Design a protein around this ligand. Structure first.
Ligand code: ANH
Ligand code: CA
Length: 223
């Protein structure tokens, strides 16, 4: 997260860290047995880390659970990143509490202008490299497709939406991928991609979760 602020220990209870010997992507807890993340974050040997704040110090509220199954979206395209979403099932159900909670799936999509909360342990520098150990937060609005495409020349599909500030300075970044974009209490986005970080006229691109609720619900019911 570039230009954000220290969230505060466990203030984003649904945020998870995907670990394969080190943190490599974020994710969202949607229930006691399932996590949603980005398809390009797929890797084998994933261990889900819940209740985290400082990812380098055991603080006492963490729950480390291995993934028993990973399901990348059937139409995921790594070339354009269309349908960049994936579900991960935990080997054992997580214990829900004040510091480990699930986030609700959307009933309908969100309109441009809506404010959202984006969080992650990604790079905090715009022109350099610096990774935080504590979770960083960032409030940003949903931009209209027209203003996004016009300003960035990005090739965006109906399964993506842009969020951020065209003036740059604030944006998600490397290491934040797979993380949540929560607006009005619902999980509306998954950090997907972008061009550099916090660049002028280059806002972040997110997976439009409202378009996948049926697939998500169906997949968890049958798995
Ligand atoms: C540009 O260089 C990168 O390393 C970015 C970082 C990044 C990741 C997530 C969000 C942001 C952001 N600014 N909000 C930035 N990664 C990527 O963007 C993802 N991998 S990528 O750079 O390989 C890529 C990008 C776009 C397509 C169609 C295909 C592949
Ligand atoms: Ca920790």
């Amino acid at each position: 997260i570039v230009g954000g602020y220290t969230c505060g220990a466990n203030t984003v209870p649904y945020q998870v860290s995907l670990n394969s010997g080190y943190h490599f992507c974020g994710g969202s807890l949607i229930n006691s047995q399932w996590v949603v993340s980005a398809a390009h974050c797929y890797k084998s040997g994933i261990q889900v880390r819940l209740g985290e704040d400082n990812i380098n110090v055991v603080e006492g509220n963490e729950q480390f659970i291995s993934a028993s199954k990973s399901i990348v979206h059937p139409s995921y395209n790594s070339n354009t990143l269309n349908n960049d979403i994936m579900l991960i099932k935990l080997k054992s159900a997580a214990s829900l509490n004040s510091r480990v909670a699930s986030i609700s799936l959307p009933t309908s999509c969100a309109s441009a202008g809506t404010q959202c909360l984006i969080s992650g342990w990604g790079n905090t520098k715009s022109s350099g490299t610096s990774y935080p150990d504590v979770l960083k937060c960032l409030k940003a609005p949903i931009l209209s497709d027209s203003s996004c495409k016009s300003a960035s020349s990005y090739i965006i599909t109906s399964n993506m939406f842009c969020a951020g500030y065209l003036e740059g300075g604030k944006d998600s970044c490397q290491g934040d991928s797979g993380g949540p974009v929560v607006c009005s209490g619902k999980l509306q986005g998954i950090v997907s991609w972008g061009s550099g970080c916090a660049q002028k006229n280059k806002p972040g691109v997110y997976t439009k979760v409202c378009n996948y609720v049926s697939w998500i619900k169906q997949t968890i019911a049958s798995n």
